[PDB]
Amino acid sequence: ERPTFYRQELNKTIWEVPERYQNLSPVGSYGSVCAAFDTKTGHRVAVKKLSRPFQSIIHAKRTYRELRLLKHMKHENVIGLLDVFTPARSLEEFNDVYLVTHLMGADLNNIVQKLTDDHVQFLIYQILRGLKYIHSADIIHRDLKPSNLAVNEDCELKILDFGLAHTDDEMTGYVATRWYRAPEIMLNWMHYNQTVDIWSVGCIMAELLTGRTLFPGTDHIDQLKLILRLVGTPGAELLKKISSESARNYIQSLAQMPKMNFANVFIGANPLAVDLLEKMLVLDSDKRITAAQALAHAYFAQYHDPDDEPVADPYDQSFESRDLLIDEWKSLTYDEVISFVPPP
Numbered sequence: 595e596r597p598t599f600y601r602q603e604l605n606k607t608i609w610e611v612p613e614r615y616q617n618l619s620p621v622g623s624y625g626s627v628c629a630a631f632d633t634k635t636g637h638r639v640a641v642k643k644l645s646r647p648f649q650s651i652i653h654a655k656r657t658y659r660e661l662r663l664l665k666h667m668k669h670e671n672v673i674g675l676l677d678v679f680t681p682a683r684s685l686e687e688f689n690d691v692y693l694v695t696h697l698m699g700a701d702l703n704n705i706v707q708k709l710t711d712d713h714v715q716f717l718i719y720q721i722l723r724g725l726k727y728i729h730s731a732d733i734i735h736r737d738l739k740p741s742n743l744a745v746n747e748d749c750e751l752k753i754l755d756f757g758l759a760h761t762d763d764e765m766t767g768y769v770a771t772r773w774y775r776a777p778e779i780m781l782n783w784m785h786y787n788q789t790v791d792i793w794s795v796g797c798i799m800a801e802l803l804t805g806r807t808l809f810p811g812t813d814h815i816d817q818l819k820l821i822l823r824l825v826g827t828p829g830a831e832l833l834k835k836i837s838s839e840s841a842r843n844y845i846q847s848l849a850q851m852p853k854m855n856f857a858n859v860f861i862g863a864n865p866l867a868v869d870l871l872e873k874m875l876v877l878d879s880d881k882r883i884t885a886a887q888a889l890a891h892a893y894f895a896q897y898h899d900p901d902d903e904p905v906a907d908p909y910d911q912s913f914e915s916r917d918l919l920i921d922e923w924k925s926l927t928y929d930e931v932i933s934f935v936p937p938p
């Protein structure tokens with residue numbers, strides 16, 4: 595039943611893992627990561643040891659959230675969970691959590707090379723295919739950007755690093771951590787929803803077409819000015835939807851600007867790519883195209899197959915409004931570890 599574990603020290607950390615995982619080598623350091631060879635499946639894998647998973651109520655709940663999300667995701671264009679384990683033999687001695695996934699090599703930055711329009715079609719198609727699945731479970735990724743997209747030699751893509759809810763310092767200044775975020779979440783205009791992810795896809799697609807960041811702001815306000823120059827200042831309809839009165843007041847201090855001609859911004863791009871960008875990069879989130887609608891856009895005619903674009907099983911997020919003690923979150927996490935069933 596229970597595998598045999600072995601111990602070793604890897605850069606000031608003790609790792610205790612099943613014998614199936616061999617040739618551990620550190621790679622990065624919310625947790626430390628090692629690459630390894632999985633002798634049961636033949637895959638190269640990433641193994642993450644969570645750091646201080648149950649040190650506070652906030653941290654214990656985040657550990658449970660990450661494990662629940664990773665156990666649910668079962669789609670070709672989304673990261674999946676190969677294994678989860680603990681060396682503990684009972685709840686009473688439970689302290690450490692380890693997560694295992696396929697080892698990812700290059701991200702989209704390490705290719706964004708010389709991309710043809712056919713490459714852009716295939717890459718964005720796969721992002722939207724994974725997003726249709728994610729959004730069908732009422733999950734919001736929140737942190738889509740090139741470093742969170744893994745790509746292999748055959749141009750096949752997986753979404754990873756779901757937003758588990760970044761600090762104020764992480765979002766300050768001339769930083770890629772903010773350049774892909776929708777304005778309504780960057781500035782806390784209103785309660786946001788899954789449409790924030792489509793704004794990020796528009797920003798990524800633009801950068802694949804031009805080779806340049808679309809909105810490389812030096813701070814929050816500089817970035818807003820770059821955004822409004824392209825898409826136009828808001829009308830009265832959107833202004834009514836901004837719940838923050840102070841944010842409303844600041845927007846109205848800016849001189850009004852019309853939306854620009856996207857064919858004159860994205861010079862020489864496929865006219866169908868220009869059309870899709872105009873439908874993604876809409877300031878009013880209610881009016882953006884959805885992932886399911888975008889898959890049917892003529893830009894993807896070569897790849898679209900409505901019989902091979904699956905949706906997710908329902909995902910129960912009621913725990914997110916639940917108030918529990920550290921040891922109750924810990925017990926819920928332990929149950930999810932021991933009930934894990936590996937993929938075929």
Ligand SMILES: CCN1C(=O)CN([C@H]2[C@H](O)[C@@H]3O[C@H]2c2ccccc23)C1=O
Nearest residue numbers: 640641642693694695696697698754755
């Ligand atoms: C170093 C390369 N690499 C990956 O291959 C996956 N990945 C991250 C995944 O999104 C999630 O956090 C990290 C991780 C490691 C193991 C299990 C689950 C996770 C990551 O950083």
Ligand SMILES: [Cl-]
Nearest residue numbers: 597612613614
């Ligand atoms: Cl083993």
Ligand SMILES: [Cl-]
Nearest residue numbers: 672673674696
């Ligand atoms: Cl995977």
Ligand SMILES: [Cl-]
Nearest residue numbers: 682688689690
């Ligand atoms: Cl343990």
Ligand SMILES: [Cl-]
Nearest residue numbers: 739740741770
């Ligand atoms: Cl990035």
Ligand SMILES: [Cl-]
Nearest residue numbers: 731732908909
């Ligand atoms: Cl659901």
Ligand SMILES: [Cl-]
Nearest residue numbers: 908909910911
């Ligand atoms: Cl569920």
Ligand SMILES: [Mg+2]
Nearest residue numbers: 741742754755
């Ligand atoms: Mg990341």
